[PDB]
Design a protein around this ligand. Structure first.
Ligand code: NA
Ligand code: NA
Length: 105
């Protein structure tokens, strides 16, 4: 399961806020410096940093809009059974001058 392992062929890595920057070896020699913002892939669960789960489409089926604003679907529990669920998209999706935009807690 060899996902990741950037550190093996990079150096001068550092973190500032949510951003990792490092200088990494290219396939045919030479280096490149790049950054990755970790806010979209790591989350704080009750004081513990965790990798965010796979996109919900991987573990949910039959997604649809129920009525004017609810996302409904059937999703897998940790025990791997599908159950019904819904979420009101009006909670956090706004019309900003004609375009759908997220506004989070
Ligand atoms: Na560079
Ligand atoms: Na505006």
């Amino acid at each position: 399961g060899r996902l990741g392992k950037f550190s093996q062929t990079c150096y001068n890595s550092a973190i500032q806020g949510s951003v990792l920057t490092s200088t990494c070896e290219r396939t045919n020699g030479g280096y490149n410096t790049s950054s990755i913002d970790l806010n979209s892939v790591i989350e704080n669960v009750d004081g513990s940093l965790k990798w965010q789960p796979s996109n919900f489409i991987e573990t949910c089926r039959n997604t649809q809009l129920a009525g004017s604003s609810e996302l409904a679907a059937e999703c897998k529990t940790r025990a791997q059974q599908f159950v019904s669920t819904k979420i009101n998209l009006d909670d956090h999706i706004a019309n900003i001058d004609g375009t759908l935009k997220y506004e989070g807690g």
